[PDB]
């Protein structure tokens, strides 16, 4: 006559960490055309509201 017993306890603790970084650079020719008046329109509002418009 043979009797057996058996126990077991497991305990697993895990940790993850994932860091992602991306930089998608897109070259459109349209964005180059819109560059033109970007700086100039700064001094079109200066001209209209601070300086004399008659010769």
């Amino acid at each position: 006559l043979r009797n057996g017993e058996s126990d077991t306890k497991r305990n697993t603790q895990s940790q993850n960490e994932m860091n992602r970084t991306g930089l998608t650079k897109q070259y459109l020719i349209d964005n180059l055309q819109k560059l033109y008046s970007m700086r100039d329109t700064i001094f079109k509002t200066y001209d209209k509201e601070c300086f004399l418009h008659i010769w």
Binding site: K9, N11, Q13, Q15
Partner: protein
């Protein structure tokens, strides 16, 4: 939860403790009347200090969830026992499962600090500190290790 802890330290241990827990200026007397003077956190003047001279120093150990604990024992709700060194109680990944946490005192004596989800108050901690190692017999040993240094 701040606990006073009075101890007797040799010269090396006293110097180490003083430099870790910054002391701007203070004189420490010893068992045998020798003294060491710290000035501007630098040792300046020491009397005739023999080996085995004991200096009395009291340090405050504070037990809080947020600050690290040097050595503690944790019991999960499932029945697992684990030991953690030098991490805060909150630093456990799953504090939810933890049921009891006992501080360890280098004498293999456990003192309950965390039960039922909350810290143990100061007075129950004092009770458990008395209670943990009642029948602790320390070896009795006495050597003078000194004699009146001067010629008299």
């Amino acid at each position: 939860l701040i606990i006073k802890h009075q101890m007797k330290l040799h010269l090396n241990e006293l110097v180490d403790w003083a430099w870790r827990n910054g002391v701007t200026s203070e004189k420490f007397h010893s068992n045998n009347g020798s003294y060491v003077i710290f000035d501007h956190s630098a040792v300046v003047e020491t009397y005739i200090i023999n080996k085995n001279d004991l200096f009395n120093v009291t340090e405050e150990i504070e037990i809080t969830l947020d600050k690290p604990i040097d050595y503690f024992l944790e019991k999960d709700m499932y029945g697992n026992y684990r030991e953690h060194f030098g991490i805060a109680i909150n630093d456990l990944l799953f504090l939810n499962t933890t049921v009891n946490i006992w501080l360890v005192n280098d004498d293999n004596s456990h003192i309950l600090i965390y039960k039922d989800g909350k810290l143990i108050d100061e007075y129950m901690y004092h009770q458990f500190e008395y209670e943990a190692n009642q029948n602790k017999h320390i070896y009795p040993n006495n050597k003078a290790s000194g004699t009146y240094p001067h010629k008299t």
